Enzyme design. Sequence first.
Site, PDB file in Angstrom:
ATOM      1  N   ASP A 110       0.879  -1.148   0.000  1.00  0.00           N
ATOM      2  CA  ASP A 110       0.000   0.000   0.000  1.00  0.00           C
ATOM      3  C   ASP A 110       0.917   1.198   0.000  1.00  0.00           C
ATOM      4  O   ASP A 110       1.548   1.491   1.022  1.00  0.00           O
ATOM      5  CB  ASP A 110      -0.856   0.001   1.265  1.00  0.00           C
ATOM      6  CG  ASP A 110      -1.810   1.177   1.321  1.00  0.00           C
ATOM      7  OD1 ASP A 110      -1.369   2.311   1.599  1.00  0.00           O
ATOM      8  OD2 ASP A 110      -3.018   0.976   1.080  1.00  0.00           O
ATOM      9  N   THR A 160      -3.525   5.915  -3.335  1.00  0.00           N
ATOM     10  CA  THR A 160      -2.321   6.417  -2.749  1.00  0.00           C
ATOM     11  C   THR A 160      -1.130   6.410  -3.693  1.00  0.00           C
ATOM     12  O   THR A 160      -0.558   7.458  -3.974  1.00  0.00           O
ATOM     13  CB  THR A 160      -1.979   5.682  -1.450  1.00  0.00           C
ATOM     14  OG1 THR A 160      -0.994   6.480  -0.773  1.00  0.00           O
ATOM     15  CG2 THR A 160      -1.549   4.124  -1.692  1.00  0.00           C
ATOM     16  N   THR A 161      -0.766   5.240  -4.193  1.00  0.00           N
ATOM     17  CA  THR A 161       0.369   5.106  -5.111  1.00  0.00           C
ATOM     18  C   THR A 161       0.181   5.931  -6.392  1.00  0.00           C
ATOM     19  O   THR A 161       1.129   6.539  -6.895  1.00  0.00           O
ATOM     20  CB  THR A 161       0.601   3.600  -5.493  1.00  0.00           C
ATOM     21  OG1 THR A 161      -0.649   2.997  -5.824  1.00  0.00           O
ATOM     22  CG2 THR A 161       1.127   2.815  -4.335  1.00  0.00           C
ATOM     23  N   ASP A 180      -8.424   0.387   3.326  1.00  0.00           N
ATOM     24  CA  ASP A 180      -8.609   0.885   1.962  1.00  0.00           C
ATOM     25  C   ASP A 180     -10.027   0.577   1.505  1.00  0.00           C
ATOM     26  O   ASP A 180     -10.672   1.415   0.879  1.00  0.00           O
ATOM     27  CB  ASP A 180      -7.608   0.236   0.998  1.00  0.00           C
ATOM     28  CG  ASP A 180      -6.216   0.796   1.143  1.00  0.00           C
ATOM     29  OD1 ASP A 180      -5.985   1.915   0.654  1.00  0.00           O
ATOM     30  OD2 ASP A 180      -5.361   0.121   1.753  1.00  0.00           O
TER      31      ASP A 180
HETATM   32  N1  LIG Z   1      -8.576  -5.115 -11.331  1.00  0.00           N
HETATM   33  C1  LIG Z   1      -7.735  -4.294 -11.955  1.00  0.00           C
HETATM   34  N2  LIG Z   1      -7.476  -4.420 -13.268  1.00  0.00           N
HETATM   35  C2  LIG Z   1      -6.905  -3.342 -13.952  1.00  0.00           C
HETATM   36  N3  LIG Z   1      -6.654  -2.180 -13.210  1.00  0.00           N
HETATM   37  C3  LIG Z   1      -6.896  -2.140 -11.892  1.00  0.00           C
HETATM   38  C4  LIG Z   1      -7.385  -3.217 -11.271  1.00  0.00           C
HETATM   39  N4  LIG Z   1      -7.433  -3.019  -9.953  1.00  0.00           N
HETATM   40  C5  LIG Z   1      -6.899  -1.672  -9.667  1.00  0.00           C
HETATM   41  N5  LIG Z   1      -6.779  -1.127 -11.034  1.00  0.00           N
HETATM   42  C6  LIG Z   1      -6.330   0.246 -11.351  1.00  0.00           C
HETATM   43  O1  LIG Z   1      -5.023   0.484 -10.801  1.00  0.00           O
HETATM   44  C7  LIG Z   1      -5.093   1.608  -9.911  1.00  0.00           C
HETATM   45  C8  LIG Z   1      -5.264   1.067  -8.487  1.00  0.00           C
HETATM   46  O2  LIG Z   1      -4.117   0.312  -8.078  1.00  0.00           O
HETATM   47  P1  LIG Z   1      -3.527   0.189  -6.580  1.00  0.00           P
HETATM   48  O3  LIG Z   1      -2.373  -0.735  -6.680  1.00  0.00           O
HETATM   49  O4  LIG Z   1      -4.691  -0.210  -5.770  1.00  0.00           O
HETATM   50  O5  LIG Z   1      -3.005   1.685  -6.288  1.00  0.00           O
HETATM   51  P2  LIG Z   1      -3.650   2.573  -5.102  1.00  0.00           P
HETATM   52  O6  LIG Z   1      -2.767   2.336  -3.940  1.00  0.00           O
HETATM   53  O7  LIG Z   1      -3.639   3.935  -5.673  1.00  0.00           O
HETATM   54  O8  LIG Z   1      -4.988   1.961  -4.967  1.00  0.00           O
HETATM   55  C9  LIG Z   1      -6.287   2.406 -10.410  1.00  0.00           C
HETATM   56  O9  LIG Z   1      -5.928   3.145 -11.587  1.00  0.00           O
HETATM   57  C10 LIG Z   1      -7.262   1.308 -10.792  1.00  0.00           C
HETATM   58  O10 LIG Z   1      -8.056   1.815 -11.875  1.00  0.00           O
HETATM   59  F1  BEF Z   2      -2.959   0.389  -3.138  1.00  0.00           F
HETATM   60 BE1  BEF Z   2      -3.765   1.443  -2.587  1.00  0.00          BE
HETATM   61  F2  BEF Z   2      -3.334   2.133  -1.433  1.00  0.00           F
HETATM   62  F3  BEF Z   2      -5.141   0.959  -2.194  1.00  0.00           F
HETATM   63 MG   LIG Z   3      -6.322   0.825  -3.994  1.00  0.00          MG
END
Ligand SMILES: Nc1ncnc2c1ncn2[C@@H]1O[C@H](COP(=O)(O)OP(=O)(O)O)[C@@H](O)[C@H]1O
Ligand code: BEF
Ligand SMILES: [Mg+2]
Lengths: 509, 537, 48, 519, 76
Positions: free
Chosen positions: A48, A81-82, A377
């Site tokens: 995360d 977040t990322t 989250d």
């Molecule tokens: N199931 C998935 N398939 C393709 N893209 C995804 C999927 N799950 C998350 N995403 C995309 O990737 C990003 C979320 O990734 P994540 O690793 O959760 O980062 P964050 O910490 O910002 O949530 C968003 O742009 C979301 O649209």
């Molecule tokens: F990966 Be994120 F912070 F949900």
């Molecule tokens: Mg996320």
Amino acid sequence: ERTTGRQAQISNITAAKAVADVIRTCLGPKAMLKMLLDPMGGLVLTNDGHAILREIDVAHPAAKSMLELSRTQDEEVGDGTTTVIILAGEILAQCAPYLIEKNIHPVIIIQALKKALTDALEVIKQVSKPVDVENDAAMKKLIQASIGTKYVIHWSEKMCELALDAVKTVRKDLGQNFEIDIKRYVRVEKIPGGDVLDSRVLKGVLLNKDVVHPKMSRHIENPRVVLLDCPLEYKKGESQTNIEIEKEEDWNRILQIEEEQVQLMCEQILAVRPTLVITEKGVSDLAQHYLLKGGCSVLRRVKKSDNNRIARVTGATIVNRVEDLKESDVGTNCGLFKVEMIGDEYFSFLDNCKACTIMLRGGSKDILNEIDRNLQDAMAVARNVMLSPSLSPGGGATEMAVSVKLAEKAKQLEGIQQWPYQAVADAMECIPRTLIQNAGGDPIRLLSQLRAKHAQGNFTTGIDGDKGKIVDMVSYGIWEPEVIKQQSVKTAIESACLLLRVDDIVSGV
Amino acid sequence: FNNSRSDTLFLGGEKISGDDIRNQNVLATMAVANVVKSSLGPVGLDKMLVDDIGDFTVTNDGATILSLLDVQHPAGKILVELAQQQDREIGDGTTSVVIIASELLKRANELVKNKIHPTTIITGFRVALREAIRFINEVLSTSVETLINIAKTSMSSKIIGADSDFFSNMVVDALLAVKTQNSKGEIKYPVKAVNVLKAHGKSATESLLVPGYALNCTVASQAMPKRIAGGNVKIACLDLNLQKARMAMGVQINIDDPEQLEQIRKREAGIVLERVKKIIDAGAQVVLTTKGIDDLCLKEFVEAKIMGVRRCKKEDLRRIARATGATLVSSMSNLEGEETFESSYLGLCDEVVQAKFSDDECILIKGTSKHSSSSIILRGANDYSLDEMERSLHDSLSVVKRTLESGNVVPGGGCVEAALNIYLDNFATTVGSREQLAIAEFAAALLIIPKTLAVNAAKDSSELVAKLRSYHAASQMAKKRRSYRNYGLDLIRGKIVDEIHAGVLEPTISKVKSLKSALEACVAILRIDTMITVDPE
Amino acid sequence: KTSRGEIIISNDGHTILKQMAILHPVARMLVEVSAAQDSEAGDGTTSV
Amino acid sequence: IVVLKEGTDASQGKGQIISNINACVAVQEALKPTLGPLGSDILIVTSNQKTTISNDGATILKLLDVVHPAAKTLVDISRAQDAEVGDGTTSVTILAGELMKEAKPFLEEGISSHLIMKGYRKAVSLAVEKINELAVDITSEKSSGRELLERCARTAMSSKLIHNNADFFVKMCVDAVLSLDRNDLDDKLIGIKKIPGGAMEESLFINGVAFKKTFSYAGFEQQPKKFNNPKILSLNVELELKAEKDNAEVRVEHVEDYQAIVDAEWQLIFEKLRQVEETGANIVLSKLPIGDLATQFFADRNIFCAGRVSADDMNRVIQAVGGSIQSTTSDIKPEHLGTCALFEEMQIGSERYNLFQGCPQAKTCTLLLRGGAEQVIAEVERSLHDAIMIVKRALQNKLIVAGGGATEMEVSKCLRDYSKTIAGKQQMIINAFAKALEVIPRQLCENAGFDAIEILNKLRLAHSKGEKWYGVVFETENIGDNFAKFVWEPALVKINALNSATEATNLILSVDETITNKG
Amino acid sequence: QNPNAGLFKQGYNSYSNADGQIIKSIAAIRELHQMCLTSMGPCGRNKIIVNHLGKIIITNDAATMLRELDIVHPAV
Ligand SMILES: Nc1ncnc2c1ncn2[C@@H]1O[C@H](COP(=O)(O)OP(=O)(O)O)[C@@H](O)[C@H]1O
Ligand code: BEF
Ligand SMILES: [Mg+2]
Ligand SMILES: Nc1ncnc2c1ncn2[C@@H]1O[C@H](COP(=O)(O)OP(=O)(O)O)[C@@H](O)[C@H]1O
Ligand SMILES: Nc1ncnc2c1ncn2[C@@H]1O[C@H](COP(=O)(O)OP(=O)(O)O)[C@@H](O)[C@H]1O
Ligand code: BEF
Ligand code: BEF
Ligand code: BEF
Ligand code: BEF
Ligand SMILES: [Mg+2]
Ligand SMILES: [Mg+2]
């Protein structure tokens, strides 16, 4: 010492760009785990974003500003977040050339970026569709979306459940907006062992504090709860209370009085006919006795946070002085008072067979912290929707839409004011790209196709994670709270705009 | 090169005389000024100043840059204390009062090297100012929106300026709403009200302007309401604390009979408890003590759903009370009794609510009887930008409090400078002599602001500086045709424009003090010819 | 710039000599005559 | 983790150019006092421990070490000035600097340096031609042949420790530029000698040549120490028995051969020795030794000698008595020898000095200098080289300009007037250089005390309003015709000066990044 | 605390390109590029390079500046 000129600018940009570089392989459904080592001792095995960048001290000022971005963003929405970090970088980076190469002043590049942000934000709400914050099924397949890309996915469904079953539980509309204080009313409790599924969202609280005296009720059917601040022992005077005795049989007199006041106190409590008395402070051995035969079980020492959550799932409003102990301060609406002994460690429950206590179980004290954060989250994007029933095309779709509507507009603007605007567009594209990369497919290939398909054929068309092919969101769906797409772009463009205001860096208080 | 020796005159320290010191001073002032000469103008930019721990702050407020920048050396401190004077006096114009000062010394010094006594130069600069101050009142004028304009141009060299139009408006708005009469007339705009707050989240634009005030506190016990009143509320602005009494510092409770123990004891709780009641019993729905509350004497407010906040900022209550008409209750007495006097001391407010802001969550007393008041709340990317947003929201919102209190503005844009320049320059011959060179230098020196306002754009600023030069030089030919000074620089485009039209307004009161002041320094330094530095301990 | 670090500027002799850090003994003597010039006339501390 | 230079400082930016200017200003302001008739002087005690005192701006800027790249060019252009000319060295730098000074305003206001460089470029071109245009060539245009060399060696000898004993030295100076063939003025002939002690003017002008007294051998004190017309034998090598150097092996198996080879050695010397006697000489000099026996011989037959004469001396010896070096004693023909008007072995300043005075057929003189300290004699020798070298370049170019700020002040005029016709950037730059020239008149007044401001300003009126030779009346502090007052200096100075000075100035304005390597 | 693996050679520094090395190098080059980018053209400027044995040098030319400097980055 000092570094004026592009010298400054550059190091700032590179700095910021590097910040991104670290967690870029943590954005995506196949995102890896950055096991970080904290100074205090233990470790952090999370992926995360914000939870990583927090555990990394940085030097370069920009790298410090870039790092706090992940925090303010983790404060608005629980998610995204990322993404903000990666975007916040690529923006600065995509400006780098027109910043010096095309000698555009920082004022101008800022005047444009601030402009391109608003337009860009339009395109976000433009592609966003609303949602039934109440439709349990929609909320689940919504919460589920932001549970992927995390160790907690092998129980995805099970998670959104505990998520909704808790968001809604502590919720309380109120109108004269919707207030959901997940923080103070959803105390989590990670317990080592068992199975993941073996975890539930008890509608009450769970304290490990046992009972003040052995022969005391292990579980009152429908207990009458009495929560109080003040301790249960002989108090003393807040002045120079000093006693002088020469009157022989007077020692016994005073020494007795103590027992007497403890009695009174027990009375006032016992009065409203209680079965369960939970105080934040202590419980004199004497007071235990008079509350024993007084007919009630006692719990000493419980945190304010722990207590005030009890007073929402027992109704029992907490009261200080007892000579004022009202009867409205009941203990109605409170199921049992179980006291299950969990592996050589006694607990106490208060479920009812406004505030719940999510109790997680996994396979280590370590593995649990993964869950807790992962859960947060979920439980946060649930709250977001609750306060903004709008969603955005996941799979980086939204991100690409704004890339085009902006790219198009920029190209049709004419003036030096175009280059910085153009960059915001070129920038945005990095998210579907980071995704496609962390997928394994060919970035130049898939993007050109995603971008094209976007240019005309619908905008809810992002990239599929484990696959690597461009898919339409609506199709297999993975919308995310529109709120996330707000912040991610709001502050990222701001960050860039701040650091671009720097043309000089100096050292000394 | 390098001064040294002693021989006779045994002195416990360093001592440079003449040329040596006289140059040292000029170099000093020069450096401290040159650091912030790259922050001048709209095209100017902010800088990051890191400490030893690694933290920092980015800011264009010349006065804070010179404050934050460790200066050791008299003539260095001088211009850092002179940059201070401004930020303390008018409130904006810091970055510039220094650049002027430095320029006056640097220049005046050159005259001495030409063999021109310091005094003859000093009187010369003195007269150039007399004429220049007078003339300054021949470009200025009474307020004839000039306000949303003043408040805007004061955000050019700042971060808040990309969103000029927005804040330029929120600035005047917020201030105005707080005006008062002080004592015997006056009508001064609170040189400090409008509690400004900041919280990271959302856009830069999404900064709210509360329609009342923003007290930064929670609500004591989480058990009481977080939002009260929709129609009317009674606010209890206290000061005395509602905790369990302790009697006189010298009041021994000597017990002789075990009887009195228990009695006087529990009395303690009630004494300050009665005080509680006599307050709830006034219609108090909202209580704002300053010295904190007990948890015992809190439950009384809770049991009664009375929003009661602990240990508040007394600097707010003083303004939260003038704003609800209430009274800062020092201690319930009046003649010889005890009461918060039902609604006699209380305040009328429309609604008291505890709004959240991600992470944070503060109280709002929006809408009130006699409030008129406001309070702004910035929202940005992080603290780094946020500190600065406000930092310059203030260096801006201050320009307004003075445009108001002193109905008189002048066209900035480096116009004032240019005008004075050519006028004093020609006027310089009205005395001839050596003294001519003085005024001449003085005048000529002023063109530092226009030159550096533009050089901060990279391009060959010798263009504008020449044009703007010529114009005024000409305008003062029938100053007749259609006289048109007020011609400043428009660096964003790179051409000379009418700043009064364009919207570039600056209060006269600034450039009038910014000038009279900066010379007061230059002179006290012009007189320096020997610097004896005692050895410390 | 005094031993304490306080900065001062002036034409008043008695005050320059006073804060000057003169070391030689018979040299310190001058400060006292300028001191007394201040105590009687109050002016001319430089000239004396 | 990687690097690109290994911790080795290097600054750049616009400030970089400004640093360099100011840097040069320092080295400049340093010499400003040593200017003008009433000019201050310096006392440098280098880390060497050798203490010196002088005014040859070159000599000062040579003792300052100086390592700053930029500011170090002022050291170079000052050296060249003491070459292609010989005088003005002090000033080449004052100006060179001053220009860089006047370039600051532009460079600061935000102007290209390539434009300032161009601007100054024309300014010099015009200013240079203007000097050529005023270079009053004469010959008998009420100037005479000697009164030009005198009037010019004089004004230039002013402002030097050698001043109040002017007449003595100018009459001495000119006389020694003439001592050599006016067809090929070679300094290397005027060979100077310094003698410990005596008045800073009890110095002697030898008509022929004078040299040390390398005479390091027994049997001297015989040999007359004075001849009128002696027969000088400017011999080049040896005159020792066993030879001073070089050998071979003598192997003999016969007792008689031993004593034989001995008698041979002796006769081998004596012959070559009488071979000299045969030349019928009175004075026998040799750049190599003259052993005890050798000098003893001539001593017997009243013939004077000296062994191991200074190399650069025999060459001045030839040029005096008109001899002609000879390496062997064999083919010694008489047009080879030489003869002066008078030879004597003095005891000047407690030091015996062989000297061939009186030589109406010489092309090389020598002159002994005196002083109460090895610093003053030293300053004379340098104060005099600056004069001799100016007399020399005043034969080859009877073109002269009246300095004392005039030439400098006038070249400003035409340059300032010209700029009117240009207008704009080039106007200010070329008009700057015009003002920048005012430094010489300016400073010249401050050094002496005259009202630098008024005397300058009063000069600008009259000079621009006519009088193309108005400068500064060193006497009654006031402006005046320095050509009339006879303050002459060859134009060859000013022309080289402004050329070479500006060079430095743009060389600096051209550098934007200075990378000092460490190691 | 942190371990360290796969090392048996001596104390070197291996910059694998899979660590964004190509760009680390573009950087190093980018730096010396700016030095030459202002020396070219008639409007070019000079640089005073001061020898590692201490000698002054001023030149518009590029191959000379570089020669007189102590470059170290392999990609440079
Ligand atoms: N199931 C998935 N398939 C393709 N893209 C995804 C999927 N799950 C998350 N995403 C995309 O990737 C990003 C979320 O990734 P994540 O690793 O959760 O980062 P964050 O910490 O910002 O949530 C968003 O742009 C979301 O649209
Ligand atoms: F990966 Be994120 F912070 F949900
Ligand atoms: Mg996320
Ligand atoms: N819009 C503008 N166009 C041209 N000049 C401006 C404009 N805005 C402010 N100025 C000028 O810039 C200077 C103030 O800028 P700043 O660097 O903030 O100085 P200070 O910090 O002392 O206020 C003044 O000369 C002001 O007249
Ligand atoms: N007699 C004089 N009267 C006025 N100026 C003079 C006189 N003698 C020399 N000057 C001027 O003084 C300057 C020469 O200074 P000087 O101290 O001689 O150093 P240098 O000759 O090495 O520059 C020139 O301007 C020269 O014209
Ligand atoms: F930076 Be200034 F004081 F507006
Ligand atoms: F300097 Be005096 F004492 F006025
Ligand atoms: F000092 Be100069 F050579 F006359
Ligand atoms: F002309 Be290039 F610098 F060889
Ligand atoms: Mg300002
Ligand atoms: Mg001379």
